[PDB]
Structure 1
Amino acid sequence: LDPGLQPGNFSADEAGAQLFAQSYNSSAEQVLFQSVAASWAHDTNITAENARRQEEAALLSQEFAEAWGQKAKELYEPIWQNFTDPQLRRIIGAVRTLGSANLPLAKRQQYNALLSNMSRIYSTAKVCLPNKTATCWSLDPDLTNILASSRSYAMLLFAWEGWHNAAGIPLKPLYEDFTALSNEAYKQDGFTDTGAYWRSWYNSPTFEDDLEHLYQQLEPLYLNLHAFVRRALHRRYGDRYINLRGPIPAHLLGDMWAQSWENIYDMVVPFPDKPNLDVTSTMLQQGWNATHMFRVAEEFFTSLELSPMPPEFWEGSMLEKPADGREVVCHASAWDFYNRKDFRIKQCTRVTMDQLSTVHHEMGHIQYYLQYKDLPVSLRRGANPGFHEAIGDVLALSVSTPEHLHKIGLLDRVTNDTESDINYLLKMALEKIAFLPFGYLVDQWRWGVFSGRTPPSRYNFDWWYLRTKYQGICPPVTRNETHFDAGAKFHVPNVTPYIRYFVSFVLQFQFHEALCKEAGYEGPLHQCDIYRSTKAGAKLRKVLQAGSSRPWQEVLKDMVGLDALDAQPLLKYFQPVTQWLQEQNQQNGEVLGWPEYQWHPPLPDNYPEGID
């Protein structure tokens, strides 16, 4: 649109390109700021006006992106990839990829419409009770808490089913259309489908195989945490609802998607009657503010000689579900406005331990932003999406330790023994191990939708194939191809790639090891706490300050000593409980896995009318 943001004109030289990029950066910062700020208004407030606006701002960006896009390749496309300066050719290579901008005007508009709509359908969805046409439940908070702490099978079933129908069914038709378009766009950028484009970010001709191999190494870990919990669950709901030889029913693991079981710790905790490793109740006791949480998280960050939250962040962030009745996308996220000034976090935070680490997780994104803000805009990325999701989790590892919790107030004791040690490790196992299958599975499903191996005619049938197959969980009520359970997961509607969370969970420990070593810690990897270690923090920040300038595979070597992802440091972390669980299941005759696939639990007695 605006002429001042249009390209200009340059030499089909590498010296021309150095200039081309220098320019793009100054202009792009504007066009990106606007589009980002527009969204920030829509997410922090969902109105038809803001959506319209957003959809507009997107059109400009798509406009901008095309101009420099087709220009950068107008004359820099038979030669880049042979440029001396790696950073330069990695920038030009980021610009030559138009993305959605390659789509005719009508189609961009359809595109942008789908996006703001799906995210709207996803965050507006509600679950209403049968007869009481009285006030509905919302994914956050109502639904989450019910899955996090309600032990009523029927009740959980009502919310699990409620949410999955409510969010999925309407989303399906739009998803199929978004996919057709998304592909069409990147098809022109040279990739087969968006799937291939998404994986090209790791630069590894071997990515998928490295991941499949990496999973086998860990599968045994999951299968054991699984049979152990499946047993604990049988113990509580009985023999009618839990099959000791079948997949677990998806709504009993204490989380809507069964992606992390840390909320059922009190039902599987091996050695109970000991100090409780869930500050979640001491946080309330002390009167923890939602802000108080973003301060403790910050404090850790500062001690490692890393920068604190800027004032803009404190003035412009939304750290609580507002009260003006405004409707917001409650999912926690971190925002980079590409203006080296504005960095904020959007999260309907309330006072919970699992929420205290999500705060750290998010700060990790902000800290990554603050660190690389001084690089060409097109390089303000993590080494790879994985590194980004890792950053806050790493520091989280040190925070979760019982020794650290005490140092800061919520673990009233200190019981240095095995039993407590096992409990801790199991708790962490419920959070990190239980997730591995899911994290893998999601983009497994998607790469196949984008490629056509999973047409809308098999959206749900291929989703539960993957879910049963990897998580060993099954749907509590029957399902069919009018359903779209994959769509009930925030990340599918809001088009976010997922294979990054897997990478993240595996290489967050490589970091944890590497950092604990420079901190000068010795003792066990799972009891390490890099707190106040300016030496450790300096090691981390070198990776941060690199953005997408250098290949992750190099930025990783410098920091960890390895050319790639490794589960070894992860196995070393959970070692004790790894052997413990394994020994426990055997004695108790458990069966690792689900041989009775195809098994489904029956409905509550009169469905669906009871104490919800």
Structure 2
Amino acid sequence: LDPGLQPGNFSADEAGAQLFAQSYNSSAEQVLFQSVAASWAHDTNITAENARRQEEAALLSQEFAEAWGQKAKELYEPIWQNFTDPQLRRIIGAVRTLGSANLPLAKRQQYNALLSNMSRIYSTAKVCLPNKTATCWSLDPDLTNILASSRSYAMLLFAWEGWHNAAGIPLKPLYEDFTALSNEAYKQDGFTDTGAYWRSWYNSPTFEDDLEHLYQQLEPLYLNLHAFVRRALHRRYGDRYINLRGPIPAHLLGDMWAQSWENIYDMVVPFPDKPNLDVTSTMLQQGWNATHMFRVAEEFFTSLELSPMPPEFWEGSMLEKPADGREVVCHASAWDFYNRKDFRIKQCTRVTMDQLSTVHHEMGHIQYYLQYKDLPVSLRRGANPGFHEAIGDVLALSVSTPEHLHKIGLLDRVTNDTESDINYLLKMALEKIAFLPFGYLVDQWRWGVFSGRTPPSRYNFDWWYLRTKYQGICPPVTRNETHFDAGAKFHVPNVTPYIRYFVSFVLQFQFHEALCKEAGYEGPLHQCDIYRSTKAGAKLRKVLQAGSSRPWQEVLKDMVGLDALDAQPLLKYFQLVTQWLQEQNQQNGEVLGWPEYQWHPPLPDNYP
């Protein structure tokens, strides 16, 4: 520990604690920058040298959070709740959280080693065909691509069986040990369990109830969608393997976790005679290039009179693919270095209509970072953890439209045909609405484990209960408590909350509606854009400047006017497809929901 990074002495006063907050701030951006700089380099190009620097940076960060966290508890754990500023209470409350650093070394060293071991066995999971094969598969590319692409039911089944079998089972012992150790650490931090810690972020005493009220508002839309897809699969696979009343076999939905079904959009799409618009042909013809694209993105924000990208951003960012042959993580990401001056993007840009849209949300994050850089570093995070991605997405929504592309000049004429825009809304539904029930059930399920209400003998039973209950899926081959299908997801062994994403996808439209309402727009909400609309920016800026200083429920209210989440706006946005599906289901007599829930298909005749 560098002494300039090691806390001093502070009184039990607020007057002292204000000085503690100030000192933590000044040290914090000096450590966090050094940490993120290393992590930036490692990700900007892989080298074992940079991986080492990455590893050392990780240790240096934890060592810093520890050295301050221990004193924050030692001096202010008896007090912090008392302090007059809700901003300061937020500052100290964040520092005062220690997480795993509560565990004594013996447990601590098991804990880290245990968490890493889960990630290893998941990331390095494998499936092998039932021969003396030279070669096995892995989740990507082999499994993701066979599962999404092929539709011979047996082959599709085996791929799903192998994965949840191989990825889950060897996790089963580890995840229990994690659950115990996880809760024990937070117990000392001040939470009943890890689950009550995660829910602590949304600072809502009624949080879990709020979700069910939201999800109940979605269920008519989701059931409408689910019931529609279910019929389509019946056309394809046969009467033996689908029940027009029952739930859907989990592996037919085109995705290993059935969390988003878009890979059956090719099979289901409405109005097969219409195209789906691709503006790439203009963009290449215009001589657009990656470097230019961001200036369009910046144009948008400047058009809202949000802040332009500072010169440092143009000096630093890796907008284009590198000139070297060096290996790089191409997946697009946006970075804030807690050093106030320089913000950074990595995009690996390929000039296509899709990545044009993608750049806008990635720059959206940068605009978000730019606005709250003025806060003390402890607060420089989204008003709540899903709130940051929402401000990212509302931007991509607007520009994805044909309406905005015409103001960009990339589109020649607007073509207001509902058959086309239904195609667009429906594919987006198969992407994101299918995700809401899944995103909801996981963190109910994990809360079930962390609260203990799912003891280890029920990990798998409570999982499939939650799947059929919410997502309308059932397992393709009988699954029993030796298996552990909850582990087969990325976010479970990586102990990463999904609930942020669900909260975000509701805040997304709850903003978009409140912006388009403010931007003077009227008409079909998916045809709104806010570009050039200074009225939207000035209100949007008020959200971004708040960062996390002000409780999100108060900030959201100041933007939208509602003290809480609501899915009515989301239903407004999807309204056109909502109506269309209701017609199509009514025409087919399709039974919404899934009675005969106690059904799942027989096995293929010679399996395998």
Q: Give the shorter-chain TM-score range.
A: 0.7 to 0.9
Are the aligned partners of 1:149 and 1:264 in contact in 2 as well (CA < 8 Å)? no
Q: Distance in 2 between matches of 1:254 and 1:443?
A: 23
Q: CA deviation at 1:502?
A: 1.4
Q: CA deviation at 1:500?
A: 1.6
- Stretch moving more, 517-526 or 541-550: 517-526
Q: Distance in 1 between matches of 2:601 and 2:463?
A: 19
Are the aligned partners of 1:262 and 1:427 in contact in 2 as well (CA < 8 Å)? yes
- Stretch moving more, 468-477 or 442-451: 468-477
Cα deviation code 1:565-596 (max 9, x no counterpart): 11121222122222221122122111111212
Cα deviation code 1:3-45 (max 9, x no counterpart): 3321101222222111111101122223334554565577778
Q: Distance in 2 between matches of 1:394 and 1:136?
A: 41
Are the aligned partners of 2:122 and 2:488 in contact in 1 as well (CA < 8 Å)? yes
- Stretch moving more, 91-100 or 124-133: 124-133
Are the aligned partners of 1:304 and 1:537 in contact in 2 as well (CA < 8 Å)? yes
- Stretch moving more, 324-333 or 476-485: 324-333
CA change 1:434–1:106 in 2 (3 A) is same
Q: Distance in 1 between matches of 2:462 and 2:133?
A: 35
Q: CA deviation at 1:186?
A: 0.8
Are the aligned partners of 1:37 and 1:337 in contact in 2 as well (CA < 8 Å)? yes
CA change 1:340–1:118 in 2 (3 A) is farther
Q: CA deviation at 1:158?
A: 4.1
Q: CA deviation at 1:65?
A: 2.7
Give the structure 1 partner of residue 559 of structure 2. 559
Gap regions ≥5 residues in structure 1 = none
Q: Distance in 2 between matches of 1:481 and 1:165?
A: 12
Are the aligned partners of 1:123 and 1:328 in contact in 2 as well (CA < 8 Å)? no
Q: CA deviation at 1:314?
A: 7.1
Are the aligned partners of 2:163 and 2:488 in contact in 1 as well (CA < 8 Å)? yes
Cα deviation code 1:489-544 (max 9, x no counterpart): 22222222111211111121110011112222122212101223343233222211
Q: Distance in 1 between matches of 2:461 and 2:281?
A: 40
Q: Distance in 2 between matches of 1:147 and 1:289?
A: 34
Are the aligned partners of 2:306 and 2:541 in contact in 1 as well (CA < 8 Å)? yes
Q: Distance in 2 between matches of 1:180 and 1:99?
A: 14
Aligned positions of 1:128-527 closer than 5 A:
128-131=128-131, 133-134=133-134, 137-277=137-277, 300-307=300-307, 334-341=334-341, 343-344=343-344, 360-405=360-405, 414-527=414-527
Are the aligned partners of 1:55 and 1:113 in contact in 2 as well (CA < 8 Å)? no
- Stretch moving more, 16-25 or 579-588: 579-588
Give the structure 2 partner of residue 125 of structure 1. 125
Gap regions ≥5 residues in structure 2 = none
- Stretch moving more, 43-52 or 253-262: 43-52
Q: Distance in 2 between matches of 1:292 and 1:138?
A: 38
Cα deviation code 1:146-178 (max 9, x no counterpart): 444444434433443344344333434333333
Cα deviation code 1:53-84 (max 9, x no counterpart): 76655444443333322323434344433433
Are the aligned partners of 1:29 and 1:377 in contact in 2 as well (CA < 8 Å)? yes
Are the aligned partners of 1:55 and 1:116 in contact in 2 as well (CA < 8 Å)? no
SS in 1 for 2:360: helix
Q: CA deviation at 1:330?
A: 8.2
Q: Distance in 1 between matches of 2:584 and 2:407?
A: 33
Q: Distance in 2 between matches of 1:139 and 1:44?
A: 25
CA change 1:468–1:53 in 2 (3 A) is farther
Are the aligned partners of 2:276 and 2:420 in contact in 1 as well (CA < 8 Å)? no
- Stretch moving more, 212-221 or 484-493: 484-493
Q: CA deviation at 1:282?
A: 9.3
TM-score (norm 2): 0.87
Are the aligned partners of 2:276 and 2:424 in contact in 1 as well (CA < 8 Å)? no
Are the aligned partners of 1:335 and 1:345 in contact in 2 as well (CA < 8 Å)? yes
SS in 1 for 2:345: strand
Cα deviation code 1:192-228 (max 9, x no counterpart): 1110011011111111111111111111110010101
CA change 1:367–1:584 in 2 (3 A) is same
Cα deviation code 1:448-482 (max 9, x no counterpart): 11111223322222222111211111233343334
- Stretch moving more, 399-408 or 231-240: 399-408
Q: CA deviation at 1:605?
A: 4.7
Cα deviation code 1:219-270 (max 9, x no counterpart): 1110010101111221222223322111112233233222223332232222
Q: Distance in 1 between matches of 2:115 and 2:348?
A: 21
Are the aligned partners of 1:277 and 1:411 in contact in 2 as well (CA < 8 Å)? no
Are the aligned partners of 1:46 and 1:120 in contact in 2 as well (CA < 8 Å)? no
CA change 1:286–1:590 in 2 (3 A) is farther
CA change 1:279–1:463 in 2 (3 A) is farther
Are the aligned partners of 1:406 and 1:413 in contact in 2 as well (CA < 8 Å)? yes
CA change 1:104–1:79 in 2 (3 A) is closer
SS in 2 for 1:81: helix
SS in 1 for 2:252: coil
Q: CA deviation at 1:553?
A: 1.2
Superposed CA RMSD in Å reads 3.7
Q: Distance in 1 between matches of 2:47 and 2:113?
A: 14
Q: Distance in 1 between matches of 2:476 and 2:282?
A: 34
- Stretch moving more, 343-352 or 569-578: 343-352
CA change 1:488–1:371 in 2 (3 A) is farther
Number of equivalent positions: 608
Are the aligned partners of 1:250 and 1:473 in contact in 2 as well (CA < 8 Å)? yes
- Stretch moving more, 34-43 or 94-103: 34-43
SS in 2 for 1:458: helix
SS in 1 for 2:253: coil
CA change 1:597–1:328 in 2 (3 A) is farther
- Stretch moving more, 173-182 or 383-392: 173-182
Q: Distance in 1 between matches of 2:370 and 2:9?
A: 32
CA change 1:137–1:102 in 2 (3 A) is same
- Stretch moving more, 105-114 or 349-358: 349-358
- Stretch moving more, 74-83 or 90-99: 74-83
Q: CA deviation at 1:322?
A: 10
Cα deviation code 1:346-388 (max 9, x no counterpart): 7888888777656554444343223222211110111111211
Cα deviation code 1:383-419 (max 9, x no counterpart): 1112112112211221332333555587776431333
CA change 1:154–1:541 in 2 (3 A) is farther
Q: Distance in 1 between matches of 2:270 and 2:113?
A: 50
Identity, in percent, stands at: 100
Q: CA deviation at 1:302?
A: 4.8
SS in 1 for 2:142: helix
Q: Distance in 1 between matches of 2:345 and 2:482?
A: 36
Q: Distance in 2 between matches of 1:3 and 1:495?
A: 33
Cα deviation code 1:319-345 (max 9, x no counterpart): 899999999988766544433356556
CA change 1:294–1:188 in 2 (3 A) is farther
Are the aligned partners of 2:290 and 2:320 in contact in 1 as well (CA < 8 Å)? yes
CA change 1:120–1:441 in 2 (3 A) is same
Q: CA deviation at 1:127?
A: 4.3
